[PDB]
Structures are given as C-alpha cells and as structure tokens.
Amino acid sequence: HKSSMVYIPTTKEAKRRNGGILNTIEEVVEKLYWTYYIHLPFYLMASFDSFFLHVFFLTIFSLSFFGIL
C-alpha cells in the first residue's frame, strides 16, 4: 500500500544521518535553555515584555550570586 503522505524523520535519525563531547556540551546547554524557557510564559508575551522579563531575571540572579559570595 502507498499514499501521498510525506513523512518527517525523527531527530535521532537526523543526527544519525548527519553524524566528540562537543555534542554532549551542546545538548546539556540546550536542555538547560529549554528547561528555563518553557516554564515561564514567554510564548504568551510580546517582544518588549519578554526582553524586560529576561533582564529582570538576569539582574536577580546576578545580584543573588554576588551576595552569596
């Protein structure tokens, strides 16, 4: 049986097709990026509001890290 549906390869298969630990570093960075991004409402905001929330969080983290030391 055959139809007119074009399929989309899985990301694992795409990495298999395209072929050290630089990949591991990249994937841990992207894991952290997604984990931070999806749990805060950035998809539901505009650009200016998202930028201001970003700088707000960055300032909080920087101040907290400075105080901790």
Partner 1 sequence: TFEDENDQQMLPNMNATWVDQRGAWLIHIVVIVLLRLFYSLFGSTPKWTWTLTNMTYIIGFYIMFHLVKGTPFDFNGGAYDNLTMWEQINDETLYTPTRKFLLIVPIVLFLISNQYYRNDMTLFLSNLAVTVLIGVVPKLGITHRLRIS
Name the site residues for partner 1 (rule: CB under 8 A): 60, 63-64, 67
Do the beta carbons of residue 45 and residue 53 sit within 8 Å?
yes
Do the beta carbons of residue 53 and residue 40 sit within 8 Å?
yes
Q: How far is the CB of 60 from partner 1 (least distance, A)?
A: 7
Residue 7 or 65 having the CB closest to partner 1: 65
Residue 40 or 60 having the CB closest to partner 1: 60
Distance of CA 59 to the CA centre of its chain: 20
Q: How far is the CB of 15 from partner 1 (least distance, A)?
A: 39
